[PDB]
Amino acid sequence: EFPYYLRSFLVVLKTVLENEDDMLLFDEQEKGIVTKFYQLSATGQKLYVRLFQRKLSWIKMTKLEYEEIALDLTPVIEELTNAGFLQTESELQELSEVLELLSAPELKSLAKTFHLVNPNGQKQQLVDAFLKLAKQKPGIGAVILKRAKALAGQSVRICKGPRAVFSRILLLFSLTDSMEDEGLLVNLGRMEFPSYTINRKTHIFQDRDDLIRYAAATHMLSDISSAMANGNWEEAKELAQCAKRDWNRLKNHPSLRCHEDLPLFLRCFTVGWIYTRILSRFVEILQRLHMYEEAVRELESLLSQRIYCPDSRGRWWDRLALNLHQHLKRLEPTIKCITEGLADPEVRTGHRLSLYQRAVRLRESPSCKKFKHLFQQLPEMAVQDVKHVTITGRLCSVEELALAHYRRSGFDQGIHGEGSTFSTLYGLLLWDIIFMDGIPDVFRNACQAFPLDLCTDSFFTSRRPALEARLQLIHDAPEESLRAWVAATWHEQEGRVASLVSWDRFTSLQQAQDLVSCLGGPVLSGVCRHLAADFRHCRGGLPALVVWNSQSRHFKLVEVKGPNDRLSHKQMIWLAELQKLGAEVEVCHVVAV
Amino acid sequence: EFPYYLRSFLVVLKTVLENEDDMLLFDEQEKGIVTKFYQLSATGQKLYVRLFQRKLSWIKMTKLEYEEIALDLTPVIEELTNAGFLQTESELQELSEVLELLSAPELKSLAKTFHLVNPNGQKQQLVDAFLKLAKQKPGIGAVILKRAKALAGQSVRICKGPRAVFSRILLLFSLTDSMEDEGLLVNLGRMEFPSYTINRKTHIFQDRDDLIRYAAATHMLSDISSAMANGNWEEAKELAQCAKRDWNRLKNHPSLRCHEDLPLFLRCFTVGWIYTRILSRFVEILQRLHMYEEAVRELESLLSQRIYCPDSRGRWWDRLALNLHQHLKRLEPTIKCITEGLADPEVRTGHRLSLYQRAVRLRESPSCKKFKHLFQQLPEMAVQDVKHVTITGRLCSVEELALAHYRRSGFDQGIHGEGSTFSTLYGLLLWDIIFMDGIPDVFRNACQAFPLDLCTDSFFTSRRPALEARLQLIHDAPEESLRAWVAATWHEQEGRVASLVSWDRFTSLQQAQDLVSCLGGPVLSGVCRHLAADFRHCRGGLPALVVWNSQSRHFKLVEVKGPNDRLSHKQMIWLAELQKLGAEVEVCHVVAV
DNA sequence: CGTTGCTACGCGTGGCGAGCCGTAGCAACGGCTCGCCACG
């Protein structure tokens, strides 16, 4: 009667409409369209949202079925058409769009009609043949168009004007979903968020145009990503080349100056940052296509600016070196690269370790004896040793095999939760700081699962005195404090959606209390500090497993590796860090059976 | 020249005289008195009605002033006296009546005259002293009488014979005004009533005597009510005890058998029903006087019969339990009471909830562990949860504060109209059914504001097919239908007095149309069904407020509660019902500032 | 309900009447607040 998708869609409109500065990014005709949506019947609102969620393409009217809305959709379609929200096949004027609308038999039929060869050819071959055939001013395109429409019959499509309005509203509601591909899910009407106070101070978008350019970059990034994921690297390349063309064409626009003044945790919500991300995928595409030459200039270009994606610099330096070392075989620029990279303070310890490791390799083979004078800068960056055990396989999940073995070794409890285990404890012990008042712009509407600066260096620096006082309080805390604090947060917040916290990670509050008792205050303090100080990079390197003996309270943090799986650099940096806090860590290899 | 009070008085006489069966309830001398009234001059008719509206007591002739009738009333008084309509002080023969007529100085003067002590005592003390002094066959009463009359001077009083004739005529004209205290206002000459056709089939009063007994019960109920309202509970008790004596003295009279055969919506216009109401106030009086013992037998007596005031049974059961539980502290009869009450199908959901709530309380404390075997009958009567918000106070009207807050929350429209808002919409959407032909005895003269069965279960059952067809038609109605129907009734009936409909509740037809558009057909259908099916009990529990956003058409039904105000059971039953129809409901608490 | 001077003793509203040689008891006194009823 009042279905979820409509409810959730209504929440988003309400939120965005509520904020006057966001509303200044739309003109009067655009606001008028939201009004028109509100003036639709209920059955009309339901169909529009069911169609708005679908891929933007034409749909045959005989394929439209939503029994829960109406047994015959025709008058609803009619309402939406009169209101300017759907268009009918009278406005279907693009040959590609209609060729996309036909089934396989129909395309074949049309093919025979125009005497195409290979009519039993695949759809994409037919589509391609027809469009070429249409390129014979003016062309026979018009005739292929009318005959295809005769076949397709009555059809509707979501109009693009109104759709783009809702599209930008959606963007405004959840900015952290825009670059999510590579911080709007169904429950939105029903999920309870944490409490905090909205506090805005800074404009992200300079004007209506700024938002529109932002949104177009977003869609392009989404397009390119889609292509790459399906292995369509050639299409992925051309899309990236166009995106590349739009970006230079836009550089030195006055709006960019204002973007540069935003703090990093807002700056990721700007057009330039998005094109930088686009350029970064461009690198991967060039490599898949073996264009290692071209990949290197793009890397050097990315690294030559310092306004966008500083987080990415380590990945860039490391890939630049790899291309220089291996595919280009240029030994002296490679040394230069590693040394610049090592000097770059944005590079976190993982890539740093990776860069250094490559230096050692280069300094120690016939190929580079002569460059010896370029290796004296080398830091003494070392990472401490861990213990490795092996267990035999079975026919199954490698973590579950590990868990069974540690239960045989006296560790009757165990959790396979990766980073979520610690991040959940972090969440439970530091909730009121994660969600504290007084930090401008980190909470911009009432539907966030985290403060916007969470995954940014300024999270810690903006809450430093409270953090310093809380981490000291944890480090010294006796068991009973630890158990109590966890219970407090658990009791007061259970169910509330906080991105750090998985309410189902533990089998119960008691299990979580038992775990914090075994880990103890110093260890917990150490891990919470790392997560607060540098959450992106810490969450990823943490051991698969935590196991413990409920009698002795002996615990081990265990990383599990099956055949052909080894430690990444991140994992090596964090097993050592954990070891430094005095936790016992172990790597468990499952061997082929 | 032709003043309102006379016009209205003339309308009543005309109506009643017009009906021959009503006229059979008066004898020839009584009809003769109406004739004599008609034979009075105009100035005579005006004075009589101005005196008939006044309290029945003696009036000093030097206090009579009606300049608009005559600058000297003497010959008019003379006309009314000759005609037998007023009596003069020659017939003032009751010591109490004359002691009531004297001012404060005069009573003091008389007091000194008869050597009363405390002559500076209050009037009621003097009045009481004189009447005691008169009790010294025969007594000195005669002497106090003559000396008081010497002081009071020329005085007149409305004669009781003719007055009681007009009194019964008034009763006959508007029977729903008789029990109104606890369904004859000035405009009567000028108010336009709805259209409908008179259709009588059943005699309410068996004869002249029946009507007279009915009227005397009415006056007693009015007396007792007056007493209670002024906190004269002791006088209220004695009046009730006499009334109690008259009722038993009357039980098994043959006229009662005919009253029992009347449908409920006429049966309320009978002597027995009135004494039942009298007995019900008797309960409240006994409690005010802390006679909780006696209150309980009266309750048990009321509940032991099923012919009168079935509507009241829930109130009775609930008060019986309260007296048993709290003041008598009898735990086992209390359980019995609640269980009988819960079994009583006359008890509506409000008192039902109240009864159950008391059961839970009794089943869950040391006092009643042992009675566990008496609690197994317990129904699973549950009532769903609502949302509660709080806002800060200001120095002002709690509903107006709420309205200001919801305007801040984006609800630019709002109405504080309680039940009248919905009942007005009900009225506008169902007018021609509320006033339809074909239901015998619901329209008995041309001056009714509602069908007589309106507030009775038989309203719905007597119009069920038309109601079922109309509520289905509303449930499915598109916005444009809703707006149109409301406009139709508004246009055709505006001004006509219908008790359900407040022509001033909305600021205009358009506001009402905008509201019905936001509420939508299903919700409206749900509320109209409740009001049709059970109008007494539904109108009272409805939220103070309806607020809405004119753009999104989001609406909320809001109940407002200031300090020390909480939800009644009725309100809890109807917030849930509204919630069931999918309306969004909210309780707004204003907190002390 | 004060202040004080003398006597005796040792249904929603507005208008307006009613109410409130010292020392202890009481009646008059006005300003003020309340309740009742007529009225539209």
Side-chain angles (χ1 to χ4, degrees), chain A residues 60 101-111 119 121-123 126:
Chain A
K60 296 199 218 163
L101 182 63
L102 311 169
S103 69
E106 293 166 337
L107 206 55
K108 165 148 135 141
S109 170
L110 191 65
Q122 253 51 281
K123 302 292 100 183
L126 303 181

Side-chain angles (χ1 to χ4, degrees), chain A residues 256-347 349-427:
Chain A
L256 308 182
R257 268 262 52 241
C258 301
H259 302 168
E260 302 165 18
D261 290 3
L262 291 176
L264 285 171
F265 73 89
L266 296 183
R267 220 216 300 293
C268 52
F269 301 129
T270 69
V271 54
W273 188 289
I274 305 298
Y275 280 119
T276 307
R277 287 167 52 91
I278 292 178
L279 292 172
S280 206
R281 330 231 56 180
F282 185 25
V283 165
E284 314 170 48
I285 298 158
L286 288 174
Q287 284 154 191
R288 240 52 142 62
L289 295 183
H290 303 318
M291 302 176 52
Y292 302 100
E293 290 270 38
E294 296 74 4
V296 170
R297 68 147 120 76
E298 297 309 315
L299 283 165
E300 287 172 300
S301 165
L302 284 170
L303 278 164
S304 72
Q305 59 82 36
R306 285 197 195 93
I307 313 128
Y308 304 108
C309 315
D311 38 278
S312 296
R313 293 202 137 250
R315 209 181 70 255
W316 294 338
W317 282 118
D318 188 275
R319 197 23 123 114
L320 183 58
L322 182 152
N323 287 313
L324 293 187
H325 192 165
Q326 294 169 33
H327 300 273
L328 288 191
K329 303 275 221 308
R330 308 203 190 122
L331 306 163
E332 178 148 15
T334 307
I335 325 297
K336 289 200 287 281
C337 172
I338 286 171
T339 50
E340 301 187 83
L342 277 176
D344 192 338
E346 310 289 354
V347 184
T349 308
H351 296 295
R352 234 171 180 99
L353 187 63
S354 172
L355 281 180
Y356 173 87
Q357 184 174 322
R358 184 172 300 270
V360 177
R361 144 75 184 91
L362 272 174
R363 196 184 42 175
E364 277 172 22
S365 68
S367 203
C368 289
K369 179 68 239 291
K370 48 181 176 170
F371 300 109
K372 209 76 173 178
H373 57 286
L374 303 170
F375 288 110
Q376 288 153 295
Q377 95 299 344
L378 266 162
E380 293 179 323
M381 224 139 288
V383 67
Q384 135 112 311
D385 85 308
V386 145
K387 182 179 184 189
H388 297 253
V389 302
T390 56
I391 54 160
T392 48
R394 202 256 301 193
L395 264 185
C396 294
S397 163
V398 296
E399 346 276 354
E400 301 297 323
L401 282 178
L403 284 176
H405 156 91
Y406 287 103
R407 287 188 307 254
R408 293 195 293 274
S409 306
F411 301 85
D412 56 289
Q413 310 295 300
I415 300 180
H416 176 212
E418 273 97 5
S420 57
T421 306
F422 292 100
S423 100
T424 292
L425 293 177
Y426 167 53

Side-chain angles (χ1 to χ4, degrees), chain A residues 459-497:
Chain A
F459 171 79
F460 194 104
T461 71
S462 287
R463 298 167 190 70
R464 197 192 303 256
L467 280 168
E468 293 295 355
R470 175 69 55 75
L471 292 160
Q472 184 57 42
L473 200 58
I474 280 191
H475 174 281
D476 301 321
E479 179 189 349
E480 186 48 67
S481 288
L482 295 180
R483 300 177 62 92
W485 295 340
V486 166
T489 305
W490 193 290
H491 284 150
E492 293 158 19
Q493 311 296 340
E494 186 180 18
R496 303 263 202 164
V497 280

